[PDB]
Amino acid sequence: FGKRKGEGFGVDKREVEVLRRAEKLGLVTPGKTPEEQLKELFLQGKVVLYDGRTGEPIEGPIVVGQMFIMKLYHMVEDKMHARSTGPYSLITQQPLG
Amino acid sequence: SKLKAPVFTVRTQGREYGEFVLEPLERGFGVTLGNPLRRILLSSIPGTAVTSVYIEDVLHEFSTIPGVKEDVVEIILNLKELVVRFLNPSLQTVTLLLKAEGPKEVKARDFLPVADVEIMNPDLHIATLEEGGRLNMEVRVDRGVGYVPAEKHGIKDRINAIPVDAVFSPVRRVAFQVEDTRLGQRTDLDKLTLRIWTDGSVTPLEALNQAVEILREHLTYFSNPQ
Amino acid sequence: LKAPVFTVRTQGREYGEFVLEPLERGFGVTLGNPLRRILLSSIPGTAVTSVYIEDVLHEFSTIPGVKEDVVEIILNLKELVVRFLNPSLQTVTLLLKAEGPKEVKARDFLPVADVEIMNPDLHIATLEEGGRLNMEVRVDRGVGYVPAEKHGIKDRINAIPVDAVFSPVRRVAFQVEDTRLGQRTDLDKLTLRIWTDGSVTPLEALNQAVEILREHLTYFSNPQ
Amino acid sequence: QKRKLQVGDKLANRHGNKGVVAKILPVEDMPHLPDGTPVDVILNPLGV
Amino acid sequence: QRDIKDEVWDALEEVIHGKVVLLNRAPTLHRLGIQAFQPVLVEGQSIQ
Amino acid sequence: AEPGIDKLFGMVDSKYRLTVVVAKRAQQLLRHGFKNTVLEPEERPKMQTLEGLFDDPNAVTWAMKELLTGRLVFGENLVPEDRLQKEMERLYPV
Amino acid sequence: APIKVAGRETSVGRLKYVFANPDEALLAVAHGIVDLQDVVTVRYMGKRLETSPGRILFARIVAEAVEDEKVAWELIQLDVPQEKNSLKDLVYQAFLR
Numbered sequence A: 001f002g003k004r005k006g007e008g009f010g011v012d013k014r015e016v017e018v019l020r021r022a023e024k025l026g027l028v029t030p031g032k033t034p035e036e037q038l039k040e041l042f043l044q045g046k047v048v049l050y051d052g053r054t055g056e057p058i059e060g061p062i063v064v065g066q067m068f069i070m071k072l073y074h075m076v077e078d079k080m081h082a083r084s085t086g087p088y089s090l091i092t093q094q095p096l097g
Numbered sequence B: 001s002k003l004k005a006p007v008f009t010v011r012t013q014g015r016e017y018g019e020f021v022l023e024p025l026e027r028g029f030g031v032t033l034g035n036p037l038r039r040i041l042l043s044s045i046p047g048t049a050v051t052s053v054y055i056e057d058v059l060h061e062f063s064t065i066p067g068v069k070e071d072v073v074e075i076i077l078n079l080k081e082l083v084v085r086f087l088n089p090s091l092q093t094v095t096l097l098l099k100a101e102g103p104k105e106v107k108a109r110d111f112l113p114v115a116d117v118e119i120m121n122p123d124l125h126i127a128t129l130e131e132g133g134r135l136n137m138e139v140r141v142d143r144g145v146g147y148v149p150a151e152k153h154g155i156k157d158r159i160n161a162i163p164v165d166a167v168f169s170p171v172r173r174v175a176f177q178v179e180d181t182r183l184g185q186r187t188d189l190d191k192l193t194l195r196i197w198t199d200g201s202v203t204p205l206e207a208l209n210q211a212v213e214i215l216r217e218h219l220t221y222f223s224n225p226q
Numbered sequence C: 001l002k003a004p005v006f007t008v009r010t011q012g013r014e015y016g017e018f019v020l021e022p023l024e025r026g027f028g029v030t031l032g033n034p035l036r037r038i039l040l041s042s043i044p045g046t047a048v049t050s051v052y053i054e055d056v057l058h059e060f061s062t063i064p065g066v067k068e069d070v071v072e073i074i075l076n077l078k079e080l081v082v083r084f085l086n087p088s089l090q091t092v093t094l095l096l097k098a099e100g101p102k103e104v105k106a107r108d109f110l111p112v113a114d115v116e117i118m119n120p121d122l123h124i125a126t127l128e129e130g131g132r133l134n135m136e137v138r139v140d141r142g143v144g145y146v147p148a149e150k151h152g153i154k155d156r157i158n159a160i161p162v163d164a165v166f167s168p169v170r171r172v173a174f175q176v177e178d179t180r181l182g183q184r185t186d187l188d189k190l191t192l193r194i195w196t197d198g199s200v201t202p203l204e205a206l207n208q209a210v211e212i213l214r215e216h217l218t219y220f221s222n223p224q
Numbered sequence D: 001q002k003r004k005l006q007v008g009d010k011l012a013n014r015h016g017n018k019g020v021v022a023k024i025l026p027v028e029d030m031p032h033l034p035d036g037t038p039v040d041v042i043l044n045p046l047g048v
Numbered sequence E: 001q002r003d004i005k006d007e008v009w010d011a012l013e014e015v016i017h018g019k020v021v022l023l024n025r026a027p028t029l030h031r032l033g034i035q036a037f038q039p040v041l042v043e044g045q046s047i048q
Numbered sequence F: 001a002e003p004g005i006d007k008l009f010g011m012v013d014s015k016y017r018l019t020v021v022v023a024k025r026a027q028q029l030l031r032h033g034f035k036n037t038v039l040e041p042e043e044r045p046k047m048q049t050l051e052g053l054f055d056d057p058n059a060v061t062w063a064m065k066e067l068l069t070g071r072l073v074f075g076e077n078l079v080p081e082d083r084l085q086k087e088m089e090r091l092y093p094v
Numbered sequence G: 001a002p003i004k005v006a007g008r009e010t011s012v013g014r015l016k017y018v019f020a021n022p023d024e025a026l027l028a029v030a031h032g033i034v035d036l037q038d039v040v041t042v043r044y045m046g047k048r049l050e051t052s053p054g055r056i057l058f059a060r061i062v063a064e065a066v067e068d069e070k071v072a073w074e075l076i077q078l079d080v081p082q083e084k085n086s087l088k089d090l091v092y093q094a095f096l097r
């Protein structure tokens, strides 16, 4: 935020709309500057989030942060399979497995 | 009463960054203009990227070069960050050459200079070479749009060429602020500020003009019904 | 990159469906969302902004001899679709006087030059024997939606401000779907649904919206 | 083979939230911070 | 796989018109472990 | 959902009897090249190709649509089975 | 806030905002005058109702999906938030009729 205040930008219109919704939720305390309320949300780990399709904010503050996520060994390239006809078993003459 | 055409302010800093203001605008038009331009700016703006690499004595991507610290996978990963600006608008493809030896850390400057092409980030590290380490390569750089993955284009200058992932889009980041403003008669008007960051092959202002032009050209399609 | 095809299906003056496909990936919502905001906020139309009824002090009163309450009459007035034929006409006052046992429709308003009532059969109030309705309603040109407690128009005392529904557009719903031309499967298909009140036609409404946006793109000219 | 992440590959964190990648959105559709930075992963809260 | 041209994909689309396929997921505990769906061709290796 | 599926279940005493009538009808159409159909040219199910509109190849779609019209007669012991086959191959060849 | 004006129990929002038809109510929401969870007065199908714009919107979703406006109004329980059971009943009730 401090970067923004020095960079010559104030609070956004949409950040106010979300703050309106947030005080109805009891997330921020009514009667504080937008910076005071946004920091109150940021200490609950929530931020204002804009939908890239619309540009409008998400109607509420959303939890955002850095998480450690792994790519596991089960990958579709290994698992996708289909057969029209194919190999058969000796005695039963049914398709193989 | 109907609002009149707003003042358009421009605060560009270098070739990397710009701030673009439009004021005053009718309520709710801050995002009506701001959002579609951001979408077009992040996707459809033409640019440049490395599409192929031929390294001497290298048959494929998983090789490793004697004397070089970095593996070929990392080398191509570094060439994917190379930003190459075409001064001549008619030029769609080039080929940069690099020859280095000895105890040197090869950076992007060491590419042999070619006319109408400027390397916007000459400090980028490429390979660390050690006493006796050698390196001769040919990098093909192209102009294109969007993101075209290596499996898609399959560009090979010769038999042993390695196709590379292409991020064509010159736009690195786009944000836009919508702040309150008034014409002193009316309130809850919108002041729109578009922040545009680029890699330098094209300029924040140039992007914004191309984005608007795409959007304009798109609205034309509504002419002929059925 | 071919030329998108543009397709229209209309049902008179209140509804039309508009499909533009194929578009490159992402462009379905890039056009639809801005056009929708415009179609709702900026399309010029007319609305009832104020009403005076003879023996009525405030909005929540009841009228002796008239079945509808005052609110109900204002509600019906919110419906009325009035079309200004004169390009320069920015406002009008409509007068109505009637009494005795009759159900009052739209046609009963005293005709005004260059003022067309599109929906003349619209019911306004039912009057019983000895019930009396004398009223002036104020109709202005505008865009969007302004609640009454905010525009605050009073020609005289006892005039009630009415929530002003200017927009000839009643609803805009749009739906984007994936579509493919040959080998490219990630393309967009845009379907636009526009509902008007009959004063502006749905196809007309869209074209005005598209026009506004082009103009706004020109604002990227003389710098500073 | 060099394997890029694709739809149907499986991801998990260290607390046992695990799921398959069902959608890859272009950066312009991703939810983003006011300063323009888009998020990477969108996890449904119904899993918690 | 490289001998497959692009007209062949349009050829397959004509074939599957109106036909359904069966989806099954084990364990098949009641009669709805199998249901019929009309398939929509997709790029990619995953069933939607 | 199959179009007008509720009306089709209306026409039968047993849902499985519907499936048989439809299945047998689709086989009649395929063997004879659709030319015994009771449908008229604008009721024919169509399929959108890259070239353009052609006849729906799926005979099972056809059979349900035909059934909805009312022009088909279904029941047991309507006609000896072999004799039906010859009269149909006589009216609409293969 | 719940209040008693003239002995009856209404709310400030029910008095301030009174909408002629549904299309208008959602137009107010579109312009940020009211949210969908705000209790408001809306005139729908001949009745002057006290509900939220959201409950009007839900009834319309149901109404347009089955393309029967009269039957649709019957099935829904409008005065309650839709949750697992009511929606389950809606599917069953819609299935029968």
Ligand SMILES: [Mg+2]
Pocket: C148, C163, G015, G016, G017, G018
């Ligand atoms: Mg009011």
